[PDB]
Amino acid sequence: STGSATTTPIDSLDDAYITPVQIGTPAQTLNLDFDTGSSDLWVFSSETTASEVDGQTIYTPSKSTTAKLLSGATWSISYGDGSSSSGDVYTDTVSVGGLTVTGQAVESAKKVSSSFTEDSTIDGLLGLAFSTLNTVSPTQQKTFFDNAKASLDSPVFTADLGYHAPGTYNFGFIDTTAYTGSITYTAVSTKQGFWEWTSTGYAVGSGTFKSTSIDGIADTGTTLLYLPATVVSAYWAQVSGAKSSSSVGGYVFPCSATLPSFTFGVGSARIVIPGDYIDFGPISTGSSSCFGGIQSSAGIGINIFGDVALKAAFVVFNGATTPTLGFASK
Template identity: 40%
Template structure:
């Protein structure tokens, strides 16, 4: 490994590469239930615990309308899921509500906790993008959007870039279970990340954005998952575009022993630490300071995610075997979602913790002392990592309780390990070798009450 580190250091020096600062979004406000509803919408799983929000199945049939009852007859029948909420007589979400409401932007956490500077075009135009290992589109606010939606954002102007090229007949669309979508057309241009320039990178220009997307602080998204789940289509046929990292590899922008990127996230409690990404090299100081070798595990990218085996968990040293279990590392998710069995074991070990139907999540008293929180570990391959106890308190649930950072994955077939987990490790996404690596990155003891910030 030492020889690889040396080669990466030389590459970094020769190319003048820099860390990409993951800037804390000052407008981001944590909200437990809204973050959970966002994940219900994004991944489309069924909740297995009670609450206002649920998936409603619909049957759609393609065919010709019958003249007598104006409905399609024949053709293919397929099922779709649509996110709904139970509401009370005032229209507010209510687990015991008898009426049904549509889920809108106000129900979900649509802002990003971290944003990164990316330069697009010649001369370069700087935008703040959400780096997301759970998706594969690079889309930006563009001059094709209405002036109202552009307001408050840095907007990419294709006509101001001498290297921009229109990609005829190419379009993109991201859709979610609440009916919201983002869509537009495509071009290619130079994209610079951390001093590394990718030429002819497909850039998806937003021409339509639902309120869910428009109300965020960032200027778009940069997907870091695998190209297979990119949404670009040519003349209506799926033709996934390469992600920036995939293009770094295919265009030989980075050497064979540096076909990776890394992520280091810190809490707002870590006043002197700066969250960052690197592209083309590993921060050896963080690896050395961990006192451990990098724990590597092969990933399964068949679904487009950074998915790896995660077959063991422990609460205060008591093991919970999860034979065959998998997890994804997702920088686009704030919470960590695990099985109901694991959730129950964790919150049973926190005095006063309970499940709150109205908030659709586990909560525990704000009076809880950090020292009384359990040691909670999840595995990356064969190695277990502690989730920093302070991060078990995600956000105030009410005046007296925290909304837990670990919640139920419902019927989702794999764990979703977002920032609550990633803040405790230095994550290495080795795309060239199709593996994921980690070392612990636990900070000194911190004040639990500052989680509210």
């Protein structure tokens, strides 16, 4: 089997991407944030504290003939940005882009933090990291991908995120029309439960490539590119007037600037992030200070190849017995 679904930016900045997902019988379609940095499929629901729902579409298990309470199971998750959610668990039929999994754990939120409430466009998350990170207790649950894997034509999914435009998540096949040149594959460590890999270096604009190992995670659920302070300082030093602002929470730059590109290495291959992808616009409405899309990972504890990086590539998440990651230009 295979699946193919379009993923759409939630706003004009590509802050996140939503993908329609069918849950239950008859189908209830919710728009979920596919997150390769976590491993829980959770939804706003009829059980979510009413004051914490503001415009989201909810899953109502009592209206699904295939929903079953997973008795005694609870979940609770905290994300890198400080947001969180928790609740109980149902199993139900879940379909993405025509690919159906029966018996998928659907984690129903009883509580969500303010950032979730305030984002009316995101109805929940669909985790695509390794199932070892799944938070369901006392019986850990599998991700949608892990449940689907055996049925897939090939044990892979691909992320093809757009810049200010829709893109695609495919399951079970590699669309050879969706990228240019060849795909370069690189080793993955699953030791921390992430799609963790080592970039071979970077360049700023038209500058020389610096060969240096940068361990990080491919994370579709993180907006920006978070890299070591040395690398980030080298990038922003090429933008007149750019500075790190403790008050704002990272590097800012004059909105009148033209940003240089940023290149990262994948083996001997190179992925180029155009400068425009690094512009996250005014820090507040009407400001002439703009927020940068490359930020320091210092104090996160891990480097994160988030959407800024991933949307410059066609990315293969190869879930074979020995997982790997592939990157192609597009």
